[PDB]
Amino acid sequence: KERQDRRLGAFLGLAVGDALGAQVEGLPKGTFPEVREMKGGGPHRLPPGFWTDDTSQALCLAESLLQRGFDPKDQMDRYLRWYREGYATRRALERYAATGDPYAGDEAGAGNGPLMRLAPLVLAYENHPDLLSLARRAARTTHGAREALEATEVLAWLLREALRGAPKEALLALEPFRGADLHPALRRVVEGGFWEAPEEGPGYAPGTLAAALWAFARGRDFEEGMRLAVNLGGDADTVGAVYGQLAGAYYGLGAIPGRWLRALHLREEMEALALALYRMSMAS
């Protein structure tokens, strides 16, 4: 159960962070009382425990992986179907709808969207030799900027190592990326830019990753780090979700506040998905 706990933690942690962060999405840091509980709210009056369309994407990706392995075309079919059933990423979806090209992300897409759906992929392809390559392809479906693709690869590595029990010190050391040829902004993050508290929750991929790493570094447990992450305001839903995936894999499901999990929308459905993805990683 110890091992399963890490996979469930990474998956549910993503949703928990998305739900909590959504409560203060768009608010400047230090202009609102400390967020500590699942109260819902935010610009979209979300009910307590409800998450954003981004977690919806992670769920679609999870289902795609379980049904037909790594299939970017199917991933986009699902995102598009979900997109139209509702009322940079939409541009990617419309590009795919018109051209059939699954890797519809453009060079202008340096946003943090791809970081929102890492967990599902790593849970299922943890042991695949081309994991980082798969992560890059999954990011390319909606975002094409160098730094967004590389940030996704770094998070993929972080999650794989965390799931394998790597210590916090090793995760933050980011050894394989030190001296690597990365976009300048991401290089600054890997070299220690995350040790300093950010002035807000960034929407830019490298900045979002740095904010999550900062919260992970300073937090002593899942709850403390999560609160640090979401209280940065800004794109708190995504920063919270990125922190949630990493901290969830590191601390485990059992370490996530029970009241947050009990309030979480589709908790049971996600637990089932997480376990199924983990099972898939241990099979053929």
PDB file of C-alpha atoms in Angstrom:
ATOM      1  CA  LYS A   1       0.000   0.000   0.000  1.00  0.00           C
ATOM      2  CA  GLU A   2       3.003   2.260   0.620  1.00  0.00           C
ATOM      3  CA  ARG A   3       3.747   2.316  -3.107  1.00  0.00           C
ATOM      4  CA  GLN A   4       0.109   2.708  -4.176  1.00  0.00           C
ATOM      5  CA  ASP A   5      -0.151   5.555  -1.667  1.00  0.00           C
ATOM      6  CA  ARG A   6       2.358   7.612  -3.658  1.00  0.00           C
ATOM      7  CA  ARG A   7       0.497   7.235  -6.952  1.00  0.00           C
ATOM      8  CA  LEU A   8      -2.861   8.021  -5.376  1.00  0.00           C
ATOM      9  CA  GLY A   9      -1.267  11.003  -3.659  1.00  0.00           C
ATOM     10  CA  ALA A  10       0.158  12.456  -6.861  1.00  0.00           C
ATOM     11  CA  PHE A  11      -3.164  12.091  -8.688  1.00  0.00           C
ATOM     12  CA  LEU A  12      -5.517  13.338  -5.970  1.00  0.00           C
ATOM     13  CA  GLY A  13      -2.967  15.944  -4.919  1.00  0.00           C
ATOM     14  CA  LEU A  14      -3.289  17.490  -8.377  1.00  0.00           C
ATOM     15  CA  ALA A  15      -7.055  17.925  -7.954  1.00  0.00           C
ATOM     16  CA  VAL A  16      -6.779  19.078  -4.346  1.00  0.00           C
ATOM     17  CA  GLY A  17      -4.321  21.796  -5.350  1.00  0.00           C
ATOM     18  CA  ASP A  18      -6.429  22.846  -8.314  1.00  0.00           C
ATOM     19  CA  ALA A  19      -9.549  23.143  -6.127  1.00  0.00           C
ATOM     20  CA  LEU A  20      -7.838  25.104  -3.344  1.00  0.00           C
ATOM     21  CA  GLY A  21      -5.948  27.393  -5.699  1.00  0.00           C
ATOM     22  CA  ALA A  22      -9.061  28.142  -7.735  1.00  0.00           C
ATOM     23  CA  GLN A  23     -10.462  29.850  -4.636  1.00  0.00           C
ATOM     24  CA  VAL A  24      -7.975  32.693  -5.030  1.00  0.00           C
ATOM     25  CA  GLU A  25      -7.213  32.593  -8.741  1.00  0.00           C
ATOM     26  CA  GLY A  26      -6.288  36.041 -10.031  1.00  0.00           C
ATOM     27  CA  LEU A  27      -5.792  37.685  -6.634  1.00  0.00           C
ATOM     28  CA  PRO A  28      -2.537  39.579  -5.994  1.00  0.00           C
ATOM     29  CA  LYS A  29      -0.323  38.070  -3.307  1.00  0.00           C
ATOM     30  CA  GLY A  30      -0.811  39.544   0.162  1.00  0.00           C
ATOM     31  CA  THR A  31      -4.181  41.165  -0.547  1.00  0.00           C
ATOM     32  CA  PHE A  32      -6.375  38.426   0.915  1.00  0.00           C
ATOM     33  CA  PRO A  33      -6.644  36.479   4.205  1.00  0.00           C
ATOM     34  CA  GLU A  34      -4.673  33.242   4.338  1.00  0.00           C
ATOM     35  CA  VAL A  35      -6.459  30.425   2.537  1.00  0.00           C
ATOM     36  CA  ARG A  36      -6.433  27.218   4.581  1.00  0.00           C
ATOM     37  CA  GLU A  37      -9.619  25.295   3.820  1.00  0.00           C
ATOM     38  CA  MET A  38     -11.827  24.012   0.997  1.00  0.00           C
ATOM     39  CA  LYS A  39     -14.362  26.831   0.918  1.00  0.00           C
ATOM     40  CA  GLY A  40     -14.923  26.987  -2.822  1.00  0.00           C
ATOM     41  CA  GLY A  41     -15.494  30.413  -4.331  1.00  0.00           C
ATOM     42  CA  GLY A  42     -13.145  32.244  -6.644  1.00  0.00           C
ATOM     43  CA  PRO A  43     -14.259  34.046  -9.837  1.00  0.00           C
ATOM     44  CA  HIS A  44     -16.416  31.075 -10.858  1.00  0.00           C
ATOM     45  CA  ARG A  45     -18.244  30.499  -7.554  1.00  0.00           C
ATOM     46  CA  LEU A  46     -16.993  26.921  -7.452  1.00  0.00           C
ATOM     47  CA  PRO A  47     -18.614  24.685  -4.834  1.00  0.00           C
ATOM     48  CA  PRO A  48     -16.196  23.531  -2.121  1.00  0.00           C
ATOM     49  CA  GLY A  49     -13.930  20.804  -3.469  1.00  0.00           C
ATOM     50  CA  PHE A  50     -14.629  21.559  -7.130  1.00  0.00           C
ATOM     51  CA  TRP A  51     -11.731  21.984  -9.549  1.00  0.00           C
ATOM     52  CA  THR A  52     -11.114  23.633 -12.938  1.00  0.00           C
ATOM     53  CA  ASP A  53     -11.290  22.507 -16.564  1.00  0.00           C
ATOM     54  CA  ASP A  54      -7.576  21.781 -16.189  1.00  0.00           C
ATOM     55  CA  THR A  55      -8.197  18.888 -13.795  1.00  0.00           C
ATOM     56  CA  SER A  56     -10.875  17.843 -16.269  1.00  0.00           C
ATOM     57  CA  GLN A  57      -8.106  17.557 -18.863  1.00  0.00           C
ATOM     58  CA  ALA A  58      -5.982  15.451 -16.523  1.00  0.00           C
ATOM     59  CA  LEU A  59      -8.954  13.119 -16.124  1.00  0.00           C
ATOM     60  CA  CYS A  60      -9.471  12.908 -19.895  1.00  0.00           C
ATOM     61  CA  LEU A  61      -5.784  12.124 -20.327  1.00  0.00           C
ATOM     62  CA  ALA A  62      -5.994   9.412 -17.677  1.00  0.00           C
ATOM     63  CA  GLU A  63      -8.915   7.762 -19.451  1.00  0.00           C
ATOM     64  CA  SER A  64      -7.133   8.020 -22.799  1.00  0.00           C
ATOM     65  CA  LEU A  65      -4.019   6.315 -21.405  1.00  0.00           C
ATOM     66  CA  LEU A  66      -5.949   3.453 -19.816  1.00  0.00           C
ATOM     67  CA  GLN A  67      -7.982   2.840 -22.962  1.00  0.00           C
ATOM     68  CA  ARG A  68      -5.387   3.076 -25.735  1.00  0.00           C
ATOM     69  CA  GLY A  69      -1.945   3.729 -24.287  1.00  0.00           C
ATOM     70  CA  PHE A  70      -0.104   6.828 -25.469  1.00  0.00           C
ATOM     71  CA  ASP A  71      -2.272   8.271 -28.242  1.00  0.00           C
ATOM     72  CA  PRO A  72      -2.061  12.087 -28.681  1.00  0.00           C
ATOM     73  CA  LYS A  73      -4.776  11.970 -31.331  1.00  0.00           C
ATOM     74  CA  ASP A  74      -7.195  10.333 -28.898  1.00  0.00           C
ATOM     75  CA  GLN A  75      -6.146  12.763 -26.168  1.00  0.00           C
ATOM     76  CA  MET A  76      -7.104  15.691 -28.371  1.00  0.00           C
ATOM     77  CA  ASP A  77     -10.344  14.020 -29.470  1.00  0.00           C
ATOM     78  CA  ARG A  78     -11.329  13.875 -25.808  1.00  0.00           C
ATOM     79  CA  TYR A  79     -10.214  17.430 -24.996  1.00  0.00           C
ATOM     80  CA  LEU A  80     -12.101  18.717 -28.043  1.00  0.00           C
ATOM     81  CA  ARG A  81     -15.261  16.783 -27.211  1.00  0.00           C
ATOM     82  CA  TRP A  82     -15.093  18.088 -23.641  1.00  0.00           C
ATOM     83  CA  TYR A  83     -14.339  21.593 -24.900  1.00  0.00           C
ATOM     84  CA  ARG A  84     -17.377  21.749 -27.182  1.00  0.00           C
ATOM     85  CA  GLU A  85     -19.662  20.259 -24.525  1.00  0.00           C
ATOM     86  CA  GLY A  86     -18.919  23.364 -22.476  1.00  0.00           C
ATOM     87  CA  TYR A  87     -19.698  27.060 -22.884  1.00  0.00           C
ATOM     88  CA  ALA A  88      -4.051  29.410 -26.232  1.00  0.00           C
ATOM     89  CA  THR A  89      -5.464  25.946 -25.557  1.00  0.00           C
ATOM     90  CA  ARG A  90      -8.766  26.610 -27.307  1.00  0.00           C
ATOM     91  CA  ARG A  91      -6.716  27.786 -30.272  1.00  0.00           C
ATOM     92  CA  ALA A  92      -4.823  24.491 -30.164  1.00  0.00           C
ATOM     93  CA  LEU A  93      -8.098  22.576 -30.015  1.00  0.00           C
ATOM     94  CA  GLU A  94      -9.563  24.506 -32.947  1.00  0.00           C
ATOM     95  CA  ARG A  95      -6.307  24.007 -34.855  1.00  0.00           C
ATOM     96  CA  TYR A  96      -6.596  20.259 -34.278  1.00  0.00           C
ATOM     97  CA  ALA A  97     -10.263  20.265 -35.266  1.00  0.00           C
ATOM     98  CA  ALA A  98      -9.390  21.895 -38.593  1.00  0.00           C
ATOM     99  CA  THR A  99      -6.119  20.168 -39.512  1.00  0.00           C
ATOM    100  CA  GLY A 100      -6.086  16.813 -37.748  1.00  0.00           C
ATOM    101  CA  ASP A 101      -2.627  17.560 -36.305  1.00  0.00           C
ATOM    102  CA  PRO A 102      -2.614  16.283 -32.679  1.00  0.00           C
ATOM    103  CA  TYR A 103       0.472  18.324 -31.781  1.00  0.00           C
ATOM    104  CA  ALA A 104      -1.467  21.552 -32.233  1.00  0.00           C
ATOM    105  CA  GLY A 105       0.503  23.665 -29.785  1.00  0.00           C
ATOM    106  CA  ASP A 106       2.344  26.695 -31.151  1.00  0.00           C
ATOM    107  CA  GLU A 107       5.640  28.401 -30.278  1.00  0.00           C
ATOM    108  CA  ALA A 108       3.705  31.152 -28.495  1.00  0.00           C
ATOM    109  CA  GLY A 109       2.395  28.639 -25.983  1.00  0.00           C
ATOM    110  CA  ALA A 110       4.735  29.019 -23.015  1.00  0.00           C
ATOM    111  CA  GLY A 111       1.918  28.779 -20.481  1.00  0.00           C
ATOM    112  CA  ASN A 112       1.740  26.285 -17.613  1.00  0.00           C
ATOM    113  CA  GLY A 113      -1.110  24.213 -19.049  1.00  0.00           C
ATOM    114  CA  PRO A 114       1.012  21.105 -19.774  1.00  0.00           C
ATOM    115  CA  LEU A 115       2.167  20.942 -16.150  1.00  0.00           C
ATOM    116  CA  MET A 116      -1.451  20.431 -15.093  1.00  0.00           C
ATOM    117  CA  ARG A 117      -1.599  16.928 -16.549  1.00  0.00           C
ATOM    118  CA  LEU A 118       1.736  15.288 -15.773  1.00  0.00           C
ATOM    119  CA  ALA A 119       0.629  12.901 -13.017  1.00  0.00           C
ATOM    120  CA  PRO A 120      -1.592  10.664 -15.192  1.00  0.00           C
ATOM    121  CA  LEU A 121       1.205  10.128 -17.693  1.00  0.00           C
ATOM    122  CA  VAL A 122       3.921   9.423 -15.134  1.00  0.00           C
ATOM    123  CA  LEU A 123       1.693   7.072 -13.141  1.00  0.00           C
ATOM    124  CA  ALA A 124       1.206   4.898 -16.230  1.00  0.00           C
ATOM    125  CA  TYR A 125       4.584   5.302 -17.941  1.00  0.00           C
ATOM    126  CA  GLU A 126       6.875   5.677 -14.918  1.00  0.00           C
ATOM    127  CA  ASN A 127       9.191   2.896 -16.064  1.00  0.00           C
ATOM    128  CA  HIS A 128       9.140   3.667 -19.788  1.00  0.00           C
ATOM    129  CA  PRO A 129      12.644   4.491 -21.080  1.00  0.00           C
ATOM    130  CA  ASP A 130      11.245   7.360 -23.162  1.00  0.00           C
ATOM    131  CA  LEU A 131       9.147   8.909 -20.380  1.00  0.00           C
ATOM    132  CA  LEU A 132      10.560  12.410 -20.845  1.00  0.00           C
ATOM    133  CA  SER A 133       9.971  12.164 -24.598  1.00  0.00           C
ATOM    134  CA  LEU A 134       6.378  11.069 -23.993  1.00  0.00           C
ATOM    135  CA  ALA A 135       5.920  13.986 -21.604  1.00  0.00           C
ATOM    136  CA  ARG A 136       7.169  16.384 -24.278  1.00  0.00           C
ATOM    137  CA  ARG A 137       4.768  14.952 -26.849  1.00  0.00           C
ATOM    138  CA  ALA A 138       1.859  15.210 -24.402  1.00  0.00           C
ATOM    139  CA  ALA A 139       2.746  18.862 -23.783  1.00  0.00           C
ATOM    140  CA  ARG A 140       2.979  19.564 -27.528  1.00  0.00           C
ATOM    141  CA  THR A 141      -0.714  18.795 -28.002  1.00  0.00           C
ATOM    142  CA  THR A 142      -1.518  22.229 -26.569  1.00  0.00           C
ATOM    143  CA  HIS A 143       1.751  24.129 -25.973  1.00  0.00           C
ATOM    144  CA  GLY A 144       4.767  24.451 -28.248  1.00  0.00           C
ATOM    145  CA  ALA A 145       7.213  26.863 -26.591  1.00  0.00           C
ATOM    146  CA  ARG A 146      10.657  25.499 -25.702  1.00  0.00           C
ATOM    147  CA  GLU A 147      10.472  26.428 -22.024  1.00  0.00           C
ATOM    148  CA  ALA A 148       7.018  24.854 -21.612  1.00  0.00           C
ATOM    149  CA  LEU A 149       8.190  21.607 -23.188  1.00  0.00           C
ATOM    150  CA  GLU A 150      11.345  21.511 -21.073  1.00  0.00           C
ATOM    151  CA  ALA A 151       9.466  22.437 -17.880  1.00  0.00           C
ATOM    152  CA  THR A 152       7.170  19.490 -18.562  1.00  0.00           C
ATOM    153  CA  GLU A 153      10.168  17.174 -18.927  1.00  0.00           C
ATOM    154  CA  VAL A 154      11.596  18.435 -15.631  1.00  0.00           C
ATOM    155  CA  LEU A 155       8.295  17.825 -13.830  1.00  0.00           C
ATOM    156  CA  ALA A 156       8.097  14.358 -15.396  1.00  0.00           C
ATOM    157  CA  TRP A 157      11.523  13.590 -13.916  1.00  0.00           C
ATOM    158  CA  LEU A 158      10.516  15.060 -10.560  1.00  0.00           C
ATOM    159  CA  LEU A 159       7.378  12.940 -10.352  1.00  0.00           C
ATOM    160  CA  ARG A 160       9.114   9.735 -11.411  1.00  0.00           C
ATOM    161  CA  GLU A 161      11.838  10.217  -8.819  1.00  0.00           C
ATOM    162  CA  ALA A 162       9.374  11.171  -6.091  1.00  0.00           C
ATOM    163  CA  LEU A 163       7.256   8.086  -6.818  1.00  0.00           C
ATOM    164  CA  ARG A 164      10.417   6.008  -6.456  1.00  0.00           C
ATOM    165  CA  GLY A 165      11.106   7.385  -2.990  1.00  0.00           C
ATOM    166  CA  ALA A 166      13.823   9.910  -3.834  1.00  0.00           C
ATOM    167  CA  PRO A 167      14.493  12.291  -0.920  1.00  0.00           C
ATOM    168  CA  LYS A 168      13.481  15.959  -1.054  1.00  0.00           C
ATOM    169  CA  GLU A 169      17.138  17.001  -1.246  1.00  0.00           C
ATOM    170  CA  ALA A 170      17.668  14.940  -4.414  1.00  0.00           C
ATOM    171  CA  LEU A 171      14.476  16.244  -6.029  1.00  0.00           C
ATOM    172  CA  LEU A 172      15.461  19.870  -5.467  1.00  0.00           C
ATOM    173  CA  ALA A 173      19.026  19.184  -6.635  1.00  0.00           C
ATOM    174  CA  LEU A 174      17.698  18.378 -10.126  1.00  0.00           C
ATOM    175  CA  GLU A 175      21.039  16.720 -10.913  1.00  0.00           C
ATOM    176  CA  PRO A 176      20.356  15.544 -14.498  1.00  0.00           C
ATOM    177  CA  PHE A 177      19.380  19.068 -15.518  1.00  0.00           C
ATOM    178  CA  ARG A 178      22.365  20.879 -14.021  1.00  0.00           C
ATOM    179  CA  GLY A 179      24.467  22.132 -16.908  1.00  0.00           C
ATOM    180  CA  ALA A 180      21.908  20.879 -19.423  1.00  0.00           C
ATOM    181  CA  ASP A 181      21.031  22.936 -22.492  1.00  0.00           C
ATOM    182  CA  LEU A 182      17.731  24.432 -21.385  1.00  0.00           C
ATOM    183  CA  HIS A 183      15.957  27.701 -22.112  1.00  0.00           C
ATOM    184  CA  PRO A 184      17.670  30.465 -20.029  1.00  0.00           C
ATOM    185  CA  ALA A 185      14.620  31.047 -17.818  1.00  0.00           C
ATOM    186  CA  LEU A 186      14.314  27.357 -16.990  1.00  0.00           C
ATOM    187  CA  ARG A 187      18.057  27.111 -16.449  1.00  0.00           C
ATOM    188  CA  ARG A 188      17.760  29.809 -13.788  1.00  0.00           C
ATOM    189  CA  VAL A 189      15.049  27.774 -12.046  1.00  0.00           C
ATOM    190  CA  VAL A 190      17.065  24.548 -12.102  1.00  0.00           C
ATOM    191  CA  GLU A 191      20.106  26.387 -10.746  1.00  0.00           C
ATOM    192  CA  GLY A 192      18.292  27.530  -7.610  1.00  0.00           C
ATOM    193  CA  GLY A 193      15.885  30.256  -8.657  1.00  0.00           C
ATOM    194  CA  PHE A 194      13.144  28.477  -6.710  1.00  0.00           C
ATOM    195  CA  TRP A 195      14.759  29.019  -3.295  1.00  0.00           C
ATOM    196  CA  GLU A 196      13.384  32.569  -3.224  1.00  0.00           C
ATOM    197  CA  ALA A 197       9.699  33.168  -2.518  1.00  0.00           C
ATOM    198  CA  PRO A 198       7.872  34.307  -5.678  1.00  0.00           C
ATOM    199  CA  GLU A 199       5.961  37.606  -5.693  1.00  0.00           C
ATOM    200  CA  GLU A 200       2.931  35.862  -7.209  1.00  0.00           C
ATOM    201  CA  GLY A 201       1.692  32.645  -8.801  1.00  0.00           C
ATOM    202  CA  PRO A 202       3.054  32.801 -12.395  1.00  0.00           C
ATOM    203  CA  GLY A 203       1.225  31.630 -15.495  1.00  0.00           C
ATOM    204  CA  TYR A 204       4.545  31.207 -17.314  1.00  0.00           C
ATOM    205  CA  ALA A 205       5.640  27.540 -17.265  1.00  0.00           C
ATOM    206  CA  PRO A 206       9.118  28.004 -15.733  1.00  0.00           C
ATOM    207  CA  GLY A 207       7.722  30.374 -13.124  1.00  0.00           C
ATOM    208  CA  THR A 208       4.912  27.992 -12.218  1.00  0.00           C
ATOM    209  CA  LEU A 209       7.416  25.175 -11.763  1.00  0.00           C
ATOM    210  CA  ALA A 210       9.639  27.425  -9.643  1.00  0.00           C
ATOM    211  CA  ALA A 211       6.688  28.424  -7.458  1.00  0.00           C
ATOM    212  CA  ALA A 212       5.759  24.783  -6.853  1.00  0.00           C
ATOM    213  CA  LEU A 213       9.363  23.837  -6.060  1.00  0.00           C
ATOM    214  CA  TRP A 214       9.601  26.757  -3.638  1.00  0.00           C
ATOM    215  CA  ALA A 215       6.453  25.643  -1.802  1.00  0.00           C
ATOM    216  CA  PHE A 216       7.765  22.077  -1.753  1.00  0.00           C
ATOM    217  CA  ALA A 217      11.127  23.207  -0.397  1.00  0.00           C
ATOM    218  CA  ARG A 218       9.680  25.346   2.403  1.00  0.00           C
ATOM    219  CA  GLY A 219       6.676  23.243   3.391  1.00  0.00           C
ATOM    220  CA  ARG A 220       7.331  20.642   6.091  1.00  0.00           C
ATOM    221  CA  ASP A 221       4.281  18.565   5.137  1.00  0.00           C
ATOM    222  CA  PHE A 222       1.683  18.442   2.356  1.00  0.00           C
ATOM    223  CA  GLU A 223      -0.700  20.863   4.057  1.00  0.00           C
ATOM    224  CA  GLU A 224       1.896  23.531   4.868  1.00  0.00           C
ATOM    225  CA  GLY A 225       3.408  23.514   1.400  1.00  0.00           C
ATOM    226  CA  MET A 226      -0.018  23.595  -0.232  1.00  0.00           C
ATOM    227  CA  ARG A 227      -0.997  26.653   1.779  1.00  0.00           C
ATOM    228  CA  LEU A 228       2.259  28.389   0.806  1.00  0.00           C
ATOM    229  CA  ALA A 229       1.621  27.604  -2.848  1.00  0.00           C
ATOM    230  CA  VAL A 230      -1.964  28.793  -3.124  1.00  0.00           C
ATOM    231  CA  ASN A 231      -1.453  31.904  -1.020  1.00  0.00           C
ATOM    232  CA  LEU A 232       0.862  33.294  -3.693  1.00  0.00           C
ATOM    233  CA  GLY A 233      -2.355  34.138  -5.508  1.00  0.00           C
ATOM    234  CA  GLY A 234      -2.270  34.646  -9.261  1.00  0.00           C
ATOM    235  CA  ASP A 235      -2.503  31.346 -11.136  1.00  0.00           C
ATOM    236  CA  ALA A 236      -2.982  29.659  -7.764  1.00  0.00           C
ATOM    237  CA  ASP A 237      -5.019  26.801  -9.207  1.00  0.00           C
ATOM    238  CA  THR A 238      -2.170  25.643 -11.448  1.00  0.00           C
ATOM    239  CA  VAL A 239       0.630  26.349  -8.980  1.00  0.00           C
ATOM    240  CA  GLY A 240      -1.422  24.483  -6.404  1.00  0.00           C
ATOM    241  CA  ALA A 241      -1.986  21.579  -8.796  1.00  0.00           C
ATOM    242  CA  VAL A 242       1.687  21.327  -9.722  1.00  0.00           C
ATOM    243  CA  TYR A 243       2.677  21.392  -6.058  1.00  0.00           C
ATOM    244  CA  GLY A 244      -0.069  18.856  -5.410  1.00  0.00           C
ATOM    245  CA  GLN A 245       1.345  16.344  -7.885  1.00  0.00           C
ATOM    246  CA  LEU A 246       4.903  16.546  -6.574  1.00  0.00           C
ATOM    247  CA  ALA A 247       4.052  16.761  -2.881  1.00  0.00           C
ATOM    248  CA  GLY A 248       1.368  14.104  -3.345  1.00  0.00           C
ATOM    249  CA  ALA A 249       3.899  11.662  -4.781  1.00  0.00           C
ATOM    250  CA  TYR A 250       6.449  12.573  -2.087  1.00  0.00           C
ATOM    251  CA  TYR A 251       4.249  12.574   1.038  1.00  0.00           C
ATOM    252  CA  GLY A 252       1.594  10.143  -0.178  1.00  0.00           C
ATOM    253  CA  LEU A 253      -2.204  10.111  -0.092  1.00  0.00           C
ATOM    254  CA  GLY A 254      -2.212   9.312   3.613  1.00  0.00           C
ATOM    255  CA  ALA A 255      -0.484  12.629   4.317  1.00  0.00           C
ATOM    256  CA  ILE A 256      -3.093  14.775   2.570  1.00  0.00           C
ATOM    257  CA  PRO A 257      -5.607  16.338   5.006  1.00  0.00           C
ATOM    258  CA  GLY A 258      -8.595  14.018   5.215  1.00  0.00           C
ATOM    259  CA  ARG A 259     -11.035  16.925   5.203  1.00  0.00           C
ATOM    260  CA  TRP A 260      -9.647  18.099   1.860  1.00  0.00           C
ATOM    261  CA  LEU A 261     -10.079  14.642   0.347  1.00  0.00           C
ATOM    262  CA  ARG A 262     -13.589  14.169   1.750  1.00  0.00           C
ATOM    263  CA  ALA A 263     -14.603  17.503   0.219  1.00  0.00           C
ATOM    264  CA  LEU A 264     -12.974  16.723  -3.148  1.00  0.00           C
ATOM    265  CA  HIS A 265     -15.277  16.354  -6.164  1.00  0.00           C
ATOM    266  CA  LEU A 266     -14.998  12.881  -7.772  1.00  0.00           C
ATOM    267  CA  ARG A 267     -12.567  11.655  -5.111  1.00  0.00           C
ATOM    268  CA  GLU A 268     -13.477   7.980  -5.566  1.00  0.00           C
ATOM    269  CA  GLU A 269     -13.402   8.157  -9.356  1.00  0.00           C
ATOM    270  CA  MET A 270      -9.890   9.605  -9.225  1.00  0.00           C
ATOM    271  CA  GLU A 271      -8.692   6.992  -6.732  1.00  0.00           C
ATOM    272  CA  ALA A 272      -9.868   4.259  -9.100  1.00  0.00           C
ATOM    273  CA  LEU A 273      -8.137   5.913 -12.059  1.00  0.00           C
ATOM    274  CA  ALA A 274      -4.879   6.372 -10.154  1.00  0.00           C
ATOM    275  CA  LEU A 275      -4.772   2.724  -9.106  1.00  0.00           C
ATOM    276  CA  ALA A 276      -5.587   1.596 -12.645  1.00  0.00           C
ATOM    277  CA  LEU A 277      -2.786   3.722 -14.079  1.00  0.00           C
ATOM    278  CA  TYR A 278      -0.349   2.359 -11.498  1.00  0.00           C
ATOM    279  CA  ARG A 279      -1.391  -1.200 -12.389  1.00  0.00           C
ATOM    280  CA  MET A 280      -0.716  -0.344 -16.028  1.00  0.00           C
ATOM    281  CA  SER A 281       2.838   0.750 -15.199  1.00  0.00           C
ATOM    282  CA  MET A 282       3.583  -2.653 -13.659  1.00  0.00           C
ATOM    283  CA  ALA A 283       2.180  -4.642 -16.587  1.00  0.00           C
ATOM    284  CA  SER A 284       3.267  -5.268 -20.185  1.00  0.00           C
TER     285      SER A 284
END
